[PDB]
Amino acid sequence: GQETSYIEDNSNQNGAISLIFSLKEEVGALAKVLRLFEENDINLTHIESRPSRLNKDEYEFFTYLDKRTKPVLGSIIKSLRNDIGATVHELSRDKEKNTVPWFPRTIQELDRFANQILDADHPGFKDPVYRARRKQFADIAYNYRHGQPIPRVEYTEEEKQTWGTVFRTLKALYKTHACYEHNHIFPLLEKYCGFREDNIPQLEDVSQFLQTCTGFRLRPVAGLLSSRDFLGGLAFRVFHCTQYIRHGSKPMYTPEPDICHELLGHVPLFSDRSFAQFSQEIGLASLGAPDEYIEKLATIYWFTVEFGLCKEGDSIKAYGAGLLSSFGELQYCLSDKPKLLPLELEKTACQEYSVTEFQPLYYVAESFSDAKEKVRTFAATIPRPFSVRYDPYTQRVEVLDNT
Amino acid sequence: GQETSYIEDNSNQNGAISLIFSLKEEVGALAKVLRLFEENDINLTHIESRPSRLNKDEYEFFTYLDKRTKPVLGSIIKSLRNDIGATVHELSRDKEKNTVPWFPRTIQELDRFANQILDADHPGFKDPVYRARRKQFADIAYNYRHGQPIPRVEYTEEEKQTWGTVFRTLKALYKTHACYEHNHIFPLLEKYCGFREDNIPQLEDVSQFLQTCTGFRLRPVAGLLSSRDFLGGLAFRVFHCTQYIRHGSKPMYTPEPDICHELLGHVPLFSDRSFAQFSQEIGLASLGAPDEYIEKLATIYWFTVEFGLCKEGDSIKAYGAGLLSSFGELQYCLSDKPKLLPLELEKTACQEYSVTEFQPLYYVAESFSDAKEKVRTFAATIPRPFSVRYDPYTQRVEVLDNT
Ligand SMILES: [Fe+3]
Ligand SMILES: [Fe+3]
Structure with missing residues (x-):
């Protein structure tokens, strides 16, 4: 609604x-x-x-x-x-009377509903070449299984050009608009991951680099996943992300998240231990949570990982992925036009909003560590017959009874 | 000497x-x-x-x-x-003046000296078929690289028979002689890892099962490794182990550790979180430690992981790998003949001993958790310009300065 x-x-x-x-x-x-x-x-x-x-x-x-x-x-x-x-x-999975909403217990179990994905108003709709190209990426995701390397794809000069356009503009905004952590990692992504204006990085390369930083890993996904499925992945430090790119007709618009959004808005912050722990906290809180709270966690995620701003001393920078990969709104979020509120999960959780560009209001987080603790606190109010914790050694979720 | x-x-x-x-x-x-x-x-x-x-x-x-x-x-x-x-x-690696003894920082770096391995008095010496068979296993190890599945090998009826003999005898001793943790896991190894009297388990299967328990993993090794190299592996919860089997001529003797020793004496205890943490503690303490302390850690390892006994209430059971895979000494260690001493690293570290069967004296550990803390304490006395810690997320060693 x-x-x-x-x-x-x-x-x-x-x-x-x-x-x-x-x-x-x-x-x-x-x-x-x-x-x-x-x-x-x-x-x-x-x-x-x-x-x-x-x-x-x-x-x-x-x-x-x-x-x-x-x-x-x-x-x-x-x-x-x-x-x-x-x-x-x-x-x-059907969440029936007296049963807890299903969630994977092992990292391998993320394969189960990884292919459970959600046109006429979207560019490239009537483009056969594009529609065919997209199916190709969807199939790579459909056939993907945990533990496998992510199939590399040779991108076209046109695609690389679309990437270049988005890149240049954002790279020229980062210094002054991007939070410290993003600006801290970017130079490494440029040096070791092929993050250039004339090159679209390969998901396998980005994944290996992430694991080496915070243990985070990528999983190619066909399209949009349910909030429960997507948030739950975070619990395993697994980022379900797209491999395709927006239609070259409109390089500054995407009805959905494409490789540009994933790589430029998400990847840098997932390479930061603090941010990784914070995002994982959201996933762990979604494990077995009732629909009502998945929705609330979805809203919290939107006003944080997607469109959040953070205090950087007396300054305010952006860390939201939907902001760090959109020049237009990246400039707008820090303007004197949007309304700012301090991050408060009880309030944020019920914040009304729409997915159209240029958000009327944003929530400011003290730090990723503070935000994380707030998520922990909020999670305790989520009704579940136990508490969860991730075991990085076995890569399995630990179900300990409520504390 | x-x-x-x-x-x-x-x-x-x-x-x-x-x-x-x-x-x-x-x-x-x-x-x-x-x-x-x-x-x-x-x-x-x-x-x-x-x-x-x-x-x-x-x-x-x-x-x-x-x-x-x-x-x-x-x-x-x-x-x-x-x-x-x-x-x-x-x-x-040369440990020269003003340099710290080399050690891998990433799990992948265990590939570097994994092939650095150490005949006439050994059975199968003059056996061409056996000598050829052994080279085969050595080559599988030589060509192995971290992250790869471990090549499966079809064992001969004769080999399986040798295994069967050792198995039967030990399995009939476990109940009364093996520590609780060993007896706790064994039934699972029998049910899910093909641990039977008529079957030699495949290293890949055992490895996957271990990772699923304590994050421990196997790495096929050609032969004996240096103490520094072998102990260091433990820091990454990586067990360098053999794939070959003793010569069918003498099923109760092995000049070195074979698949029987690895699978029956080591694997069960590595599947226990408490033991895994304890053994890892020994590896972390060996990271960059001077030769003098590697030797001391080698002796401590011998009187623990290899030939240690532990209190089980008013009782005393065995957990040492060299004991849990040797019927003869497994019976002897709990007899009224050997001399027992309480685990005390300062003393144990300088305990004199030989590798011949039937140890004159054994050290009794309070528990794996106590032993672990003792190792931690002992490690603090090891001269190194910093302290180490393992990051299971990135699978890399964290070098924080001395505490
Ligand atoms: Fe996103
Ligand atoms: Fe051994």
Whole structure:
């Protein structure tokens, strides 16, 4: 009702169900559990057992199931609760009564709904060459799987020209408008990632560089993802980003985020430990959060990662990605025209807004570290039967009970 | 002078030199530094700059150089110190006057001396088929590079039989002799890693399972590595391990560690967060440590990871890898014959011993967590111009100055 950046999630015909539960070791305990699944016509391939990372005498179970196993899940949970003796949380992509909204527990699980993507008013609409080019990029994303290198693509002189145009203009604004962290990293992206006016950087190169900075990594995505899916990725320090470029007809406009927006507005700040931790905090807070709060986190993300400004002493600079990759609004956000408010999540979370250019008002963050803590605080109010934390060693989410 | 487990390191014809230093951002600062290298005939390929993980206004430099750049390094360091203005630490594989013993800073750098490996009295010596088989495994290791999957190998029925023999005997001793953590994980290795009496598990499978538990990973190695090189790997939660198996002639003896020793004595405990942290602590303490302390850490490792026992209430169980993979000594270590001493690093570090079977005395650790703290404490006494820490996100070692 304003065309916001919030995108409700969708479930496939199979959806996804995950039973979170641990089990203290006992003679025949492990065999009992697995037998319980196996006996219910559940391929033990979707059943994984690992040593608990919290308690040395427990086992953590991971179940990769879907709506197909719904008819038996009930009895299985009852058995676990009453007979075997375990605390179980049911995750469901369909978010039904008594189930927690599904979220990936392992980095590999980001493959599941990575292809769940959202024309006539958009440039390149009636361009066959462009429409074909776009499908090519969408297919690279569709076929992508975690852990794989990101397919390199040779861009056309025309495309590189479109990039050049956007680059030049922004590069001439950064010094005076971009927050310190952005200006700090950019020179490295220029030196080691091919970030030039006459060159479109390859996603693989950018990804490897990011991992080497904050452990952040890219994942080619076909188009827009649901807010839940996209924000959740951040929890794993994974940035779902596009590989295509806007239509060369209008180099200063994009109905959606293209390679120019991703590389110039996002990448620099994801290379900063402070910003990476802050953005990850938003993702961790989205894990299993109710739709109502995903939307609120979506709004918070919009007024921060996308369109946020930050104090730089007595000065105010921009760090929002939608600002750092748009010369027009980058100049406008720091003008005497927009209304500024201090970052306050309870307020920001319910801030009304539209996706059209030149935002009427912006929120100013004290620092990325302050913003992060504010997110942590806000997350505590999000209704979920437990708390989450990311394990960079195993690249798996740790589900500890509410604190 | 007793044939200990300590192996002094060796340098190639090129060796390795790394200049650790950071630089606060300043107009022309970055360009100055890189120009300084470039002007000294140093390919800027061996010069890498990244955002400092500690201070948002600094850059961390990584230099992949070798003895070839020795004639110019002097002036370069002077320039950095006096002219540019930076604190530099020089790492050298040759450990010369005023240089710190070299160690990898990134996980990829473990490739450098991974192939630096250490017959007539050993079974299979005069066996051409075996000697050929061994070279095959050595070559898989020689050609291995970090990040690659570990080549799978089809083992012979004879080899599998040798494994079976060792397996059966040990499996029948674990319940009563193995520490809780080992017995806790084993059932999972049996269920998900092909750990059976009639099957030799593949290193890739074991590695993927380990990463999923404690972030630990395997790296096929040709033979014995220097203590410095091997212990240092632990800092990255990387276990350099063999892929070959002992000669089928003597299934209960191995002049060196084979797949049986690695998989049955090491892997289970590396899947335990507590043990992983403890072993990593030993590796981090070896980073840049003087030879004298590498040797001491080697002895500590021997009386812990290799041949250690731990309190399990009023009981005493075994967790040492050389014990958990040797039925004979596994039975002996818990007998009334060996002399037991409480783990005390100052003492243990200088404990005299030989590599022959059946150790006269063993050291008992309170727990893996206690042992870990003891290692931390001991490490503080190790002479190094700074302290280290591992970053699991970037998989790089963090060099913070002494605390
Ligand atoms: Fe964006
Ligand atoms: Fe060993």
